[PDB]
């Protein structure tokens with residue numbers, strides 16, 4: 001409806017993304033001549049973002065899913081943001097058949113609210129991702145939702161991406177077939193920056 | 200997968216139902232000769248259910264949607280059933296980063312729970328429905344969900360049917376074309392008997 | 399030449415009234431007697447426009463056909479949305495019962 | 511006779527590798543170079559069985575065709591499930607960007 005002739009498939013903004021299925025012909029890979037950090041760093045310039053990009057990831061060494069679940073629960077106890085309106089605007093007020101002078105109690109107000117909040121907040125977990133030799137830097141920090149539980153009462157809903165931002169990184173592009181004429185160019189790589197409870 | 204040859208379309212149990220789109224040729228209608236309550240009542244026999252069936256509906260006289268909303272809210276304040284496990288099993292316990300000795304308070308326990316309950320309970324509203332001359336009794340009491348608000352926190356979910364029961368009523372069936380050879384036979388007419396919060 | 403006339407006309411919705419007696423289903427279904435079911439027919443050739451309601455795949459396949467027709471057929475005009483009707487019929491226990499039959503009525507068509 | 515051989519073979523999934531250079535899309539899409547897209551083809555004639563993944567409407571239409579073929583075509587073999595691939599390409603502002611393209615890969619076929 002945007003383009004009249006639909007002679008190409010259109011792109012979509014749904015996240016998250018599977019990474020490129022890349023072809024293993026070695027012509028496409030960049031070789032050590034221009035795999036030198038210094039020119040790479042200057043060509044990318046201000047796009048460089050060391051909180052999100054790297055030649056060698058912190059995430060390394062010196063089951064782990066129960067750990068994801070425990071991380072997630074901790075992160076939900078200190079939700080960022082402002083309390084959402086839909087929760088903040090909750091006075092547990094009308095009780096005796098659509099009211100009392102106070103079905104609950106002031107105190108219990110905010111506490112019920114903070115519980116609703118932690119129960120329905122959806123944190124972004126981060127993890128380093130290996131994009132492969134055709135990108136540089138090759139490792140990028142990527143966001144994700146925790147979706148092994150429900151974020152609603154009652155149960156049904158699940159955390160999913162709700163905002164995204166783009167990292168700018170570099171790609172080893174070969175113009176001609178067989179990977180003749182290669183070079184690095186800025187490319188926009190999307191990452192999840194917010195999650196929200198959703199059906 | 201139930202039937203190997205799929206040479207008829209299969210029936211489904213989703214509710215609710217649109218009523219038959221009936222054809223207005225007057226041959227199909229029963230005429231006053233066997234439209235006599237007494238034989239009707241005896242032929243249906245014990246199927247007769249005066250809480251659900253009638254020749255002439257209470258719902259009559261001696262905007263009205265804001266009324267639906269107010270009815271719905273009242274009905275949610277005295278939910279039937281047992282408190283659902285998923286709510287009953289809620290101790291608002293772990294607070295200071297996945298706990299305290301008590302994030303909330305006993306009292307506030309049950310009260311938060313009753314609020315979750317009324318907020319997520321989905322009542323069946325009832326209404327009399329005119330099935331037309333080809334059925335008898337012609338008026339039947341039919342159930343429904345209230346779906347003009349969300350039954351979840353956060354918002355997304357909506358009340359939908361979750362159980363059903365069948366009324367047995369009678370249909371004026373014509374064997375041959377043109378409505379030659381007609382008669383009344385038991386038929387199963389489904390009605391919504393439970394609603395549940397759902398995506 | 400054995401086919402309907404569906405070359406220069408594009409993918410579109412058409413009427414079709416289906417009578418159950420004509421399919422021999424009058425002793426299975428007692429009401430209604432029939433329904434407006436519609437059907438889709440027409441072409442999905444290159445280029446497709448937005449009105450053809452094509453999937454991305456149908457767009458790729460259409461371009462692949464244009465370019466070597468022997469490699470793949472063109473996509474087909476098929477329903478993109480259907481609705482239900484309710485039907486009164488004898489079931490396996492010979493009880494008569496009323497239910498919904500999903501996906502019985504074509505509401506819109508597209509290239510698939 | 512002008513058509514692929516698709517009479518006695520039933521509706522089924524087939525392979526199809528699509529190379530973007532072959533469609534002239536190498537200056538729009540820089541990666542991947544192509545993808546396994548598949549396609550559907552085959553017959554949907556009466557009777558259909560459960561493996562044909564037919565909608566109720568496609569069952570009604572198949573019976574209507576059997577019985578007078580001029581009244582309606584037979585339903586078509588079309589995809590019932592597709593998946594996405596991710597693709598790196600130049601956009602309208604000539605910026606290169608990575609995104610998901612939905613409905614690009616056929617995973618299953620059915621009578622529609």
Ligand SMILES: *[C@@H]1O[C@H](CO)[C@@H](O[C@@H]2O[C@H](CO)[C@@H](O)[C@H](O)[C@H]2NC(C)=O)[C@H](O)[C@H]1NC(C)=O
Pocket residue numbers: 409410411449450451505506507508
């Ligand atoms: C493509 O989709 C559109 C709508 O999504 C179909 O358009 C409509 O259906 C009826 C036909 O009875 C039209 O009169 C409506 O105005 C259309 N409505 C809208 C939303 O624009 C159309 O059938 C589809 N294309 C094909 C090939 O069927």
Ligand SMILES: *[C@@H]1O[C@H](CO)[C@@H](O[C@@H]2O[C@H](CO)[C@@H](O)[C@H](O)[C@H]2NC(C)=O)[C@H](O)[C@H]1NC(C)=O
Pocket residue numbers: 521522523561562563617618619620
């Ligand atoms: C009908 O649906 C089925 C599955 O829903 C398709 O079946 C599968 O797809 C692959 C083909 O690569 C088979 O090897 C799988 O075993 C099947 N899986 C299941 C769930 O049974 C089939 O493609 C569909 N029918 C048609 C005509 O495509």
